[PDB]
Enzyme design. Structure first.
Site, short mmCIF file in Angstrom:
data_model
loop_
_atom_site.label_atom_id
_atom_site.label_comp_id
_atom_site.label_asym_id
_atom_site.label_seq_id
_atom_site.Cartn_x
_atom_site.Cartn_y
_atom_site.Cartn_z
N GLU A 11 0.79 -1.19 0.00
CA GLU A 11 0.00 0.00 0.00
C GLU A 11 0.83 1.26 0.00
O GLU A 11 0.32 2.31 -0.38
CB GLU A 11 -0.79 0.02 1.30
N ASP A 20 -6.85 6.57 -4.52
CA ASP A 20 -6.30 5.25 -4.63
C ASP A 20 -6.38 4.77 -6.08
O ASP A 20 -6.79 5.53 -6.94
CB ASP A 20 -6.93 4.36 -3.55
N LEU A 32 -8.87 3.74 3.45
CA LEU A 32 -9.87 4.43 2.63
C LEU A 32 -10.67 5.48 3.40
O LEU A 32 -11.18 5.21 4.50
CB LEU A 32 -10.85 3.38 2.17
N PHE A 104 -8.01 -6.81 3.77
CA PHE A 104 -7.64 -5.43 3.98
C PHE A 104 -7.87 -4.60 2.74
O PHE A 104 -8.39 -3.49 2.77
CB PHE A 104 -6.13 -5.44 4.30
#
Length: 164
Positions: A11, A20, A32, A104
Site C-alpha cells: 500500500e 487510490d 480508505l 484489507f
C-alpha cells in the site's frame, strides 16, 4: 516478514489525502476515507477519524495508528465471518497473511465472494487456487500486487516480497 511489513510494501505510506487506484480518497497506509467524490467529504471523514482538524494532512504516528486499527479490524472480520474463519483456521502462518492482505484491500464481503478459490485453498490445492484467483477483476486491475498475494498462497513462502 510479517503482515505489517507485507501490507506496508503493497500500500505505501502517504501523509497527504490521495486517490487510490480506484480513484477513492485515501491517506496513510491504504486507509480508505470515503468512496464519495468530494474532497470535502474526505477531509471531514479524516478529521473524524483522527480526532483533530487535520486540514488533509497527518503525521507518521497517526498513519501508523490507523494502520494498527485497520489490520486489527481485518483479522476480526475474518474471525467473524463463517466462510472466512473456516479457511483461515485451515491455513499455515504465511498463507494466513495472504488472506488477511486480501481482506484489507477488498473487504470481507468482497473476499467472501471468491467462493471457488476459498474452497480450493481449504482443500490445499495450491496451483489450482492460484489459477482461479487470477480470473478476477482484482487481478486485472492491480496485477503486480495480486501476483505477489497469489504467489504467497501458491508457495507458502515470502519469496514474492523478498525482492521488494
Amino acid at each position: 516478514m510479517n503482515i505489517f511489513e507485507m501490507l506496508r510494501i503493497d500500500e505505501g505510506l502517504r501523509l497527504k489525502i490521495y486517490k487510490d487506484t480506484e480513484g477513492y480518497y485515501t491517506i496513510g497506509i491504504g486507509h480508505l476515507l470515503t468512496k464519495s467524490p468530494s474532497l470535502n467529504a474526505a477531509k471531514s471523514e479524516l478529521d473524524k477519524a483522527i480526532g483533530r482538524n487535520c486540514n488533509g494532512v497527518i503525521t507518521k504516528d497517526e498513519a501508523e495508528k490507523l494502520f494498527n486499527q485497520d489490520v486489527d479490524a481485518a483479522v476480526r472480520g475474518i474471525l467473524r465471518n463463517a466462510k472466512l474463519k473456516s479457511v483461515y483456521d485451515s491455513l499455515d502462518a504465511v498463507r494466513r497473511c495472504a488472506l488477511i492482505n486480501m481482506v484489507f484491500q477488498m473487504g470481507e464481503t468482497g473476499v467472501a465472494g471468491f467462493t471457488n478459490s476459498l474452497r480450493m485453498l481449504q482443500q490445499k490445492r495450491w496451483d489450482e487456487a492460484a489459477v482461479n484467483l487470477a480470473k478476477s477483476r482484482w487481478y486485472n486491475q492491480t496485477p503486480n500486487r495480486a501476483k505477489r498475494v497469489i504467489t504467497t498462497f501458491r508457495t507458502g513462502t515470502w519469496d514474492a516480497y523478498k525482492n521488494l
